[PDB]
Amino acid sequence: NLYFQDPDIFNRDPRDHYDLLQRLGGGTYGEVFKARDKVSGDLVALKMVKMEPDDDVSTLQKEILILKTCRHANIVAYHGSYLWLQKLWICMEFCGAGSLQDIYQVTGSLSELQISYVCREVLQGLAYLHSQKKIHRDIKGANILINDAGEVRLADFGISAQIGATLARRLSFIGTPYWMAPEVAAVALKGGYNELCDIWSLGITAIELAELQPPLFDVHPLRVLFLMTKSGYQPPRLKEKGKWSAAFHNFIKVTLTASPAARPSATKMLSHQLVSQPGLNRGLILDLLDKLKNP
Amino acid sequence: NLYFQHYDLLQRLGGGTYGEVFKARDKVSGDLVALKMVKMEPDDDVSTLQKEILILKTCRHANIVAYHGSYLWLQKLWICMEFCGAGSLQDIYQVTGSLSELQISYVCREVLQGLAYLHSQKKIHRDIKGANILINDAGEVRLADFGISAQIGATLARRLSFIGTPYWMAPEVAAVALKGGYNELCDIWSLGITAIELAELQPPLFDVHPLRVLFLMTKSGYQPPRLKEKGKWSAAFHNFIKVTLTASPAARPSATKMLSHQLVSQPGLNRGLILDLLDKLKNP
Ligand SMILES: Cn1cc(Nc2ncc(C3=CCC[C@@H](NC(=O)c4ccccc4)C3)nc2C(N)=O)cn1
Ligand SMILES: Cn1cc(Nc2ncc(C3=CCC[C@@H](NC(=O)c4ccccc4)C3)nc2C(N)=O)cn1
């Protein structure tokens, strides 16, 4: 729909249009490289995903169309895709400072104002994704990128941006779909039903930026999961008291509401004093980036 | 609410991430039982054990593997249950070949009785398929369990294995109690697919990549599957498949309404049909 706001995939080596520079990272999502446009000199990031020989082109085109229509200032901008020698290459906006986890592992804990600006920017991205009937499902410091201008970008839009190995692992969790009714298959493909899980993850991420680890990081993962099934379950909180304002403690209290029925939406969270206060701008993050270079 | 409604290990029957199931014999009478050996969670307490045992004791029906009792021994929870000697319908049809229309009609009636019971208790099974329908030596049909709500421990371990660490996950994504996006009618669809599976040895689209199937089923004009060999089946069986596989859940019939369908309400549907199927195993 052109009323809401050119080829889908090039059958060509992206090295025909870009000079591959340094490897930025890697993992289950594939490998990401910094690159430079041969004509304009503009910098981009290129993600290389290994494809299976039997991956069908019909499904790949449907997946790429989702990347093409899901766009917001607070999500890494998608530019295009290349399919060459069994590798899918996704071209996108370059975020020079890497993830918030890459940064805080050097700088230490963020200030309350720096966290407030990050939360506001992530909530703007989530309000957009939730309006499009998508669920991110992987909000955390390692998945929030920062560019050299101090701007915040979600690394991708989560569930519906998965391709390659990450998507293969999610398909294993879903299991065989041949007996699912269409409405069950819809929830499985979307990655869930309740988008308010993202609001909880943002609350945990605010603690992660304040404390350098999410709550209970040291507890065996299967125990953390089992404790969430118990009737006595209590959500986590900030470890320190006086270091943080009453507005920050309240933001954590309301985002970390165990019952999704009582948890606020992304748009309602954007009205919370913590993220609606004046003085939240990229200058706060330029100060964090300067700390990174001159410690 | 009461107003509503030792052992010798013989051989391993089943196993998975949940634990193991063994065939067992009572030393006193020689009665055969199935014993499921479960590792309890490190944070399992008196109240969590009590709620799971209460659900096992109270969620009861003839067409669901019967709970007999449980005990703690060798640091494991042992659940004693009804023994179903012939295994699952999948274990059987992989040897015998496809079931006859009458055999499928009896299996569908028996599963629908189990589902009408679960749905009356506000439970959604969400795991109906040939591999999860067990048959005893008398030809009787039993759902292996009451569904995904009897598999919480295994789902948590599967989530850790394929999704990752849980530190940023909301508690509702793990507690998985009142799931949204669908209701009990998803079980009626799965039973329709199971009827095709018993007729054809595979569900429809069994050879299509899972991601492609998810995109196909979620497309607006999705056409529900049908039995592929038209002349082999009656018009009642074709209609049973058509109504169970209603794409819109708002229009899909309930388990109790399905029990009134000519296919499963016809006379002559009894466990002898399944004893005939088990006779094919002795001399294949
Ligand atoms: C250490 N370092 C890392 C970086 N910079 C990046 N590091 C990692 C990544 C990503 C990793 C995994 C997801 C990927 N996103 C997508 O594939 C995608 C985006 C939009 C729509 C659909 C899909 C982004 N991107 C950068 C960067 N864009 O600059 C600088 N320094
Ligand atoms: C090959 N073979 C297999 C069998 N027989 C069984 N095989 C597998 C299983 C099961 C496997 C996993 C689920 C388990 N059910 C439960 O844990 C449960 C039951 C009721 C309520 C709540 C939970 C039953 N049971 C048998 C059997 N009872 O005789 C013979 N031959």
Q: What is the 3-state secondary structure (H, E, C) of B62-98?
A: CCECCEEEEEEECCEEEEEEECCCCEEHHHHHHHHCC
Number of domains comprising chain A: 2
Contact at 8 Å (CB) between B83 and B112? no
Select from B193, B218, B249 the Cβ nearest to the Cβ of A179: B193
* Residue found under tokens 């200030």: A111
Statement to judge: residues A116 and A226 lie in one domain: yes
Statement to judge: residues B98 and B233 lie in one domain: yes
Q: Which helix (H) or strand (E) holds B268?
A: none
Contact B157 A222 (CB under 8 A): yes
Statement to judge: residues A132 and A266 lie in one domain: yes
Question: Where among B83, B113, B145 does a domain terminate?
Answer: B83
Which amino acid type is present at position B127? D
Q: Which two tokens stand for residue B233?
A: 């089946």
Statement to judge: residues B198 and B177 lie in one domain: yes
Q: Is B21 annotated as a binding residue?
A: yes
Question: Where among A75, A94, A113 does a domain terminate?
Answer: A94
Which amino acid type is present at position A177? P
Q: Which two tokens stand for residue A227?
A: 């404790």
Atom of ligand 2 nearest to the CA of B79: 17
Statement to judge: residues A146 and A266 lie in one domain: yes
Contact A226 B159 (CB under 8 A): no
Statement to judge: residues B102 and B232 lie in one domain: yes
Nearest residue to B130 (alpha-carbon basis) of B95, B82, B179, B178: B95
Q: What is the C-alpha to C-alpha distance for residues A118 and A125, in angstroms, rounded to an integer?
A: 11
Give the method used.
X-ray
Contact at 8 Å (CB) between B182 and B125? no
Nearest residue to A192 (alpha-carbon basis) of A129, A118, A115: A129
Residues of B with catalytic function: 127
Statement to judge: residues B25 and B122 lie in one domain: no
Statement to judge: residues B129 and B248 lie in one domain: yes
Pocket flag, ligand 1, residue A235 (CB < 6 Å):
no
Question: Where among B67, B83, B99 does a domain terminate?
Answer: B83
Q: What is the C-alpha to C-alpha distance for residues A276 and A279, in angstroms, rounded to an integer?
A: 9
Cross-strand pairs, A154? A75, A144
Statement to judge: residues B130 and B271 lie in one domain: yes
Q: Is B205 annotated as a binding residue?
A: no
Resolution in angstroms comes to: 1.8
Q: Which two tokens stand for residue A264?
A: 């606020």
Statement to judge: residues B121 and B186 lie in one domain: yes
Statement to judge: residues A37 and A114 lie in one domain: no
Centre of ligand 1 from the C-alpha of residue A287, in Å = 22
Going through chain B in order, the beta strands assigned E by DSSP cover 7-16, 19-26, 32-39, 67-73, 76-82, 87-88, 133-135, 141-143
Pocket flag, ligand 1, residue A104 (CB < 6 Å):
no
Q: What is the C-alpha to C-alpha distance for residues B256 and B39, in angstroms, rounded to an integer?
A: 37
Question: Structural domain of residue B65, as residue ranges?
Answer: 1-83
Pocket flag, ligand 1, residue A67 (CB < 6 Å):
yes
Statement to judge: residues A238 and A110 lie in one domain: yes
Q: What is the C-alpha to C-alpha distance for residues A135 and A196, in angstroms, rounded to an integer?
A: 8
Contact residues, chain A, for B45 at CB < 8 Å: 230
Does residue A61 sit at the B interface (CB-CB below 8 Å)?
A: no
Which amino acid type is present at position B19? G
